[PDB]
Each structure stands twice: as structure tokens, then as C-alpha cells.
Write a protein that binds this DNA or RNA. Structure first.
Ligand SMILES: Nc1ccn([C@H]2C[C@H](O)[C@@H](COP(=O)(O)OP(=O)(O)OP(=O)(O)O)O2)c(=O)n1
Ligand SMILES: [Mg+2]
Ligand SMILES: [Mg+2]
Length: 516
DNA sequence: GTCCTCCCCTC
DNA sequence: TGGAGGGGAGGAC
């Protein structure tokens, strides 16, 4: 009993086979996979260049992605192209594709940009908008590969996915009769006791698993195991599952590399939040694995603060630093040691801060009715044990077309509508591509126009768009756009308004119809 | 009841 | 940065 048995139960293991519940198991095996230098790799592949070519993706005068080759010269995202040229004589800057105002398609103008001397080879900010479609297209191809490999994939941003490897790990653990640990030892023989129990079917779901067999310690992790204290690699079933998951994840990443050409970095752990930190730890082309017994070593390595966690990077994180009196460094360890035993300790502390007459609820981002959830979230995050589910997203949720405007390039309603015509062409084209690619009817329901005046004042309007089929979709979007921009022009009467500094159209709500 | 506006989160 | 995109609160309707 107890230290004579695993820390984990049959329930926790069997849960890995449930897509709805696998994430809440302490045995969960989550991967976060992030494309290295994504937009720069897309341009590299498009132009038939190699990983040794110092490519940068350029948007107007800013570098928005830097190849690992260019990084060797000290080039950083948001360098200007001129600053980058001073660091690397052999630099290959490639401008994003663009739409020209007055046209209804996008294209690349290779050999063109602000760095080019020839005045015939400029891509003027007055006259063009960006197309990110080449990057979106490649993102969707990658998504298709991830979903072919794994039954639960969350697209987290244009170049990131989370994978729940629970079913793959479980199935391998229990059923894989071919996997070799050594030249003399198969996985099936190493795990003969647990497989016998499982097939025998005689276990109690609430009973602890047996201690791991010595023979499973021959199982190898694939990738970089984060382990500065030199802890034993395989000591319980979580380590077994994680090691199996590292083997599978390398195979998935190799499929991405072989089919599309892209290198990835990857984080492997029992939770999404730790995976995301681990994927960014080592780049390019690496997989960082964070064992449960190494979570505190990792979180406390000095790279991370509580604000490093998803949702805590902005004003709520800053409020929590003030409310919880967190230090400027080693805040994660501080949270852990100050409320060491349970989340109720932290909840009690929060409730007192919040119940004070002088706490301003109208400006706070803390919900005083939800302090139990906040306390548990902070308690578990500080220990690397906050498990969030993965969501499989619809084909699309929202779609935006945006132009930040310089000079007088939008100086009247005539100019606004000219830009709306580009937005409507772009959005309709994106919708048609999704319909073809996923065999759906994709129907915009709501549109929002947002703009900024010369004084940077925001004006916005949203409402319904009618549907008449794909062949009338651009027209239906433009009808609403024109309506909204003229309405806002009236609202701006006698106020600082033209020339605008920004105009955007967003389809904020879609209906998606499946076809047989 | 849902819709519109404004705001906060991320890459 | 610009140009995305995800998500939710709460008063308007
Ligand atoms: N503020 C940002 C951040 C990123 N991107 C784009 C360019 C990136 O290539 C892509 C993915 O973002 P990442 O943060 O993953 O950065 P990279 O993939 O470029 O580099 P890394 O190898 O560090 O992941 O999104 C952008 O347009 N604006
Ligand atoms: Mg990336
Ligand atoms: Mg990213």
C-alpha cells in the first residue's frame, strides 16, 4: 500500500482513452507544436530556398518573421529592413503578398519593396493592403496533417497547435505488440503485468496502479528532457506515458517536415500551459519534455513569471501582482510557497482583498464571485498542474480585413468605399476557398466596421449581413460596409475625422453548413 | 430572449 | 507594428 504503489490510479489511466476527460488526468500527455519562424519558412518553401538562406518576411518596412539562418546575424522580429541589411549583407527580404487598391485579387511582387532602389519596384503603403493568405493556406495544410495523426487537435493560432495524445499513448501502452525497447525486449513483455491486469479486467477503477516494472525503465524519451537536477527518467506511469508520447510526437513532427518542409519546436507535458512554455524553450527543430517531477525545476528556472502564463500577460496579471503583493522576480515560487497547502489559503486571501469597501469592482478584472476558480487556477499554475481542455475549433469563427492608413490615403467616403471594395473581394475569396477545401457552405451573418480618425478616435458599427449565395457574397458585404461607413461619417460630423488612420471589416459570426 | 458596443487576451 | 484572431460583459433593444 501507498508508497508501495504508484501515485496514479486505474481511473486516471483509463481516462486517457476519453477525449472529453483525458486532459484532467494527472497522466495526461499534451503536446504544443509551434512552427519555427513560420512566415519566413513559408516564403523559403515558396521560393525554393534552403534552411541556410537568411530569409526575412517583410511587411511594409518591418520584419515580421526571421529565419533561423538570419537570426545567426543578430536579426530580430520588428527590426526594420534597413537595420537588418546592416547586420547581413546576404539577406533575402521577401515582402508579404499584397492587394492593390482598385483590384480584387492578391499577388506577390517578388523583387519589390522599400529596400529596392528602382522606383518602379516599390510596394507603396498608400496603394496596397497585405494578404496573409499564403500563411493561412499553409497553416490549414499543417492542420490537416495534425488531425490525420491525432483525434483531438486545437488550432491555437496561425502557427500553433495543441494535441491530446491520450488515445495514442493509452493504445500503445496497452495494445502495441511490435514496439521494441531494446534488441532483446519488447514493450509487450516489459508491460506484461499491467496488460494482464487490463485484459483480465479484474481491477477496481479507484485502486492505485502497481509500481512500474523495472523493465519499463529501458523505454527512452525522444527529445530533450528538461532535467537540471539529474532526476531519474522513468519512476512512475506518468513518465511511461510521456515517453511514449514523445516517440509519437516526433513521428508527427517528422510528417510535417517531410510533407510540407517545416521545422517545428514542441513542448510535451501533462498540461497545455506547461507545453506552451516548453515549446518555446529550445528552437529550432527541438522537442522539450517536462516530466511531472521536473515541473518546479522548469517553472523556477528563472525564465518565467506568473505573467508568462496564458491569460495573465496583460492587465489582470498586473492587478494580481499588486493584489497578491508578488515580487518582481520568482513570482511563481512565491505564489507556491506563500499558499503552500491548498487553494483555499489563497482564496481566503483574495476574498479579504476584494471585500474591502475601497476595492473598485468597476475597474478590477477579478470577479469577486469567482475567487474559488481564480485561487485554484493560480495554485495549480504555480505547480504546473493546471489542466485546461483542448477545443476543436470550427472551420472559421471570424474573418478580418484591415488597413492602417498613412497620409491622406483615406480622406473621404470615396476613399473608404474604395478600401471596402478590396476587403469585400478578399473576404469573399477566403470564404470560397474554405467552402471548396472543407466541403461546407460558409455563410456570413454579422459584419463589423471599425475605424480610427486622424485623432485616433475609434468608431465602430456592427449588424446583420444578408445571404444570397457565394456569387453575390461580395456585393452583400459591400452593401453593409457602405451603410456603416456612411452612418459613422454622420456620427463624426463636426469632429476630428478625415483622414482616417485605420479602417477594417470583420465578419464576426458565420453559419457553417455541412455537406454530405 | 438576442444584439451591439466596448474591452481584454494572444500571435 | 500591422494585421490578424479568440473571447466575454453588460447595457441596448
Ligand atoms: N506579433 C506577431 C507575432 C507573430 N506574427 C506572425 C509571424 C510569425 O512567423 C507567426 C508565428 O508567430 P511565432 O510567435 O510562433 O513566431 P515565429 O514562428 O516567427 O518564430 P518562432 O520560431 O520563435 O516560433 O505569426 C505576427 O505577424 N505578429
Ligand atoms: Mg512559431
Ligand atoms: Mg506562436
Amino acid at each position: 500500500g501507498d508508497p508501495h504503489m504508484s501515485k496514479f490510479t486505474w481511473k486516471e489511466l483509463i481516462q486517457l482513452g476519453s477525449p472529453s476527460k483525458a486532459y484532467e488526468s494527472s497522466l495526461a500527455c499534451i503536446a504544443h507544436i509551434d512552427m519555427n519562424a513560420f512566415f519566413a519558412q513559408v516564403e523559403q518553401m515558396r521560393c525554393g530556398l534552403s534552411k541556410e538562406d537568411p530569409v526575412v518576411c517583410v511587411q511594409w518596412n518591418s520584419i515580421i518573421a526571421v529565419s533561423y539562418a538570419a537570426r545567426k546575424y543578430g536579426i530580430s522580429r520588428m527590426d526594420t529592413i534597413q537595420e537588418a541589411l546592416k547586420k547581413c549583407s546576404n539577406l533575402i527580404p521577401i515582402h508579404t503578398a499584397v492587394f492593390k487598391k482598385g483590384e480584387d485579387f492578391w499577388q506577390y511582387h517578388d523583387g519589390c519593396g522599400s529596400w529596392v532602389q528602382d522606383p518602379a519596384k516599390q510596394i507603396s503603403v498608400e496603394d496596397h493592403k497585405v494578404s496573409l493568405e499564403p500563411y493561412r493556406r499553409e497553416s490549414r495544410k499543417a492542420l490537416a496533417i495534425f488531425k490525420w495523426a491525432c483525434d483531438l487537435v486545437e488550432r491555437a493560432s496561425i502557427d500553433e497547435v495543441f494535441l491530446d495524445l491520450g488515445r495514442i499513448c493509452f493504445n500503445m501502452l496497452m495494445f502495441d505488440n511490435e514496439y521494441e525497447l531494446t534488441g532483446d525486449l519488447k514493450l509487450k513483455d516489459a508491460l506484461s503485468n499491467i496488460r494482464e491486469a487490463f485484459i483480465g479486467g479484474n481491477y477496481d477503477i479507484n485502486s492505485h496502479l502497481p509500481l512500474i516494472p523495472e523493465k519499463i525503465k529501458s523505454l527512452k524519451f525522444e527529445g530533450d528532457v528538461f532535467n537540471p537536477e539529474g532526476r531519474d527518467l522513468i519512476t512512475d506511469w506518468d513518465d511511461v506515458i510521456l515517453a511514449l508520447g514523445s516517440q509519437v510526437c516526433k513521428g508527427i513532427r517528422d510528417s510535417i517536415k517531410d510533407i510540407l518542409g517545416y521545422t517545428t519546436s514542441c513542448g510535451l507535458s501533462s498540461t497545455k500551459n506547461v507545453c506552451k512554455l516548453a515549446s518555446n524553450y529550445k528552437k529550432p527543430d527541438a522537442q522539450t519534455i517536462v516530466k511531472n517531477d521536473c515541473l518546479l525545476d522548469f517553472l523556477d528556472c528563472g525564465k518565467f513569471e506568473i505573467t508568462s502564463f496564458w491569460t495573465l500577460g496583460g492587465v489582470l496579471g498586473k492587478e494580481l501582482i499588486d493584489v497578491l503583493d508578488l515580487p518582481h522576480e520568482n513570482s511563481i515560487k512565491h505564489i507556491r510557497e506563500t499558499w503552500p497547502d491548498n487553494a483555499g489559503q489563497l482564496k481566503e486571501f483574495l476574498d479579504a482583498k476584494v471585500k474591502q469597501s475601497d476595492y473598485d469592482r468597476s475597474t478590477s478584472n477579478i470577479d469577486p464571485l469567482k475567487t474559488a476558480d481564480l485561487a485554484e487556477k493560480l495554485f495549480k499554475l504555480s505547480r504546473g498542474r493546471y489542466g485546461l481542455p483542448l477545443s476543436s475549433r470550427p472551420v472559421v469563427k471570424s474573418m478580418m480585413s484591415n488597413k492602417n492608413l498613412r497620409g491622406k490615403s483615406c480622406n473621404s467616403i470615396v476613399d473608404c468605399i474604395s478600401w471596402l471594395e478590396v476587403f469585400c473581394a478578399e473576404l469573399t475569396s477566403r470564404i470560397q476557398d474554405l467552402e471548396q477545401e472543407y466541403n461546407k457552405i460558409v455563410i456570413p451573418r454579422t459584419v463589423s466596421i471599425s475605424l480610427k480618425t486622424k485623432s485616433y478616435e475609434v468608431y465602430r458599427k456592427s449588424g446583420p449581413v444578408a445571404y444570397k449565395g457565394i456569387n453575390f457574397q461580395s456585393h452583400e458585404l459591400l452593401k453593409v460596409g457602405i451603410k456603416f461607413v456612411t452612418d459613422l461619417d454622420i456620427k463624426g460630423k463636426n469632429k476630428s475625422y478625415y483622414p482616417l488612420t485605420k479602417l477594417s471589416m470583420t465578419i464576426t459570426n458565420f453559419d457553417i453548413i455541412d455537406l454530405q
